[PDB]
Amino acid sequence: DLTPKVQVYSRFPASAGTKNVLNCFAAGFHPPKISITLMKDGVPMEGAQYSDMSFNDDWTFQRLVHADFTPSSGSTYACKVEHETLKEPQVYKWDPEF
């Protein structure tokens, strides 16, 4: 189908209290309009940036969103995704692997 396939991952291997970048990558979706929000404990993270709209060889669209952050062991990080193929927003939790 054409719903977003979403991965959340940190730029570097994560460790508590060390500056890093949190990534949310959505791919395989259509149409290209899409909402992607990085959050810390349900709060939108500040300084987030999005890639220029682009697509895979099979024409499906994709977008990377990223923001600087300092992971805290106390916190939940996640990526909230809204798309026309989605009746409700989809929340993808980051698995820190501390």
Partner: protein, 269 residues
């Protein structure tokens, strides 16, 4: 050395709040080298790759991109009715060229409408192929005018390869700089089973492989791969997971091969 130049063009009736309706992203060997969008109306190099570019080259890139934007706008205002139309619509184009190791050339030129194949142009035979009877209309009009074929034979086989050679030379420092992955192996237990995840962070160039081994023998049968996905600094990320009984958790190695590693690396939990 085999090398590639690719442009990814998107026009959109409904790109979303504050987003440009027409975008171009250019790639050299899976590195973004420049971009254009309908808000800035400017084609710009990625200075981390192309640090010392002349304005005149990018003046040219800008005007060609603005023409592409006009053409996408023209088509988006015609194809929906022709296909019979009511929702949002998209138009896409991918074109470029390859220079094979022996110096021979390949051109690519493909279009899609609402995310489905629409039209392709084959440089070596100078022929079009239409994806359906509606696209066939545009095919016949373009071949009968007899202008597109010669322009894009030139565009793909001459201009693209020249620009590829220029980007390869101007961006050689960034293009050749190998970045070793930082590999993290993790394991989490749930419902009594241990999922082992091998994550490779921040490698360049893009090609990588990741395998899971037990007692030195490969175990592909129960491995899931997440795919190679981008970081924002032009490096990449890739992952592999495998489920195993918590008793045998010390017995698995993930094997990472990457051009930055003289020998494949073995990592455990």
């Amino acid at each position: 050395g085999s090398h590639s130049l690719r442009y990814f063009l998107t026009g959109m009736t409904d790109p979303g709040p504050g987003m440009p309706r027409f975008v171009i992203v250019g790639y050299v060997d899976d590195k973004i080298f420049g971009t254009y969008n309908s808000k800035s109306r400017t084609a710009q190099p990625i200075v981390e790759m192309l640090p010392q570019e002349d304005q005149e080259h990018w003046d040219t890139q800008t005007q060609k991109a603005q023409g592409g934007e006009r053409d996408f706008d023209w088509n988006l205002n015609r194809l929906p009715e022709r296909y019979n139309s009511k929702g949002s619509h998209t138009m896409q184009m991918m074109f470029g060229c390859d220079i094979l190791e022996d110096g021979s050339i390949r051109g690519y030129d493909q279009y899609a409408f609402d995310g489905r194949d629409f039209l392709a142009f084959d440089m070596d035979t100078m022929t079009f192929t239409a994806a359906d009877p509606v696209a066939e209309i545009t095919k016949r009009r373009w071949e009968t005018e007899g202008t597109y074929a010669e322009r894009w034979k030139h565009e793909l086989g001459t201009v693209c390869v020249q620009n590829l050679r220029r980007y390869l030379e101007h961006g050689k420092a960034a293009l050749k700089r190998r970045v070793q992955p930082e590999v993290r192996v993790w394991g989490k237990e749930a419902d009594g089973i241990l999922t082992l995840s091998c994550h490779a962070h921040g490698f360049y160039p893009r090609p990588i492989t990741i395998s899971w081994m037990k007692d030195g023998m490969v175990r592909d049968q129960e491995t899931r791969w997440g795919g190679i996905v981008p970081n924002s600094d032009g490096t990449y990320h890739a992952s592999a997971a495998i489920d195993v009984l918590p008793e045998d958790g010390d017995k698995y190695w993930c094997r990472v091969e990457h051009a930055s590693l003289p020998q494949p690396g073995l990592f455990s939990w």
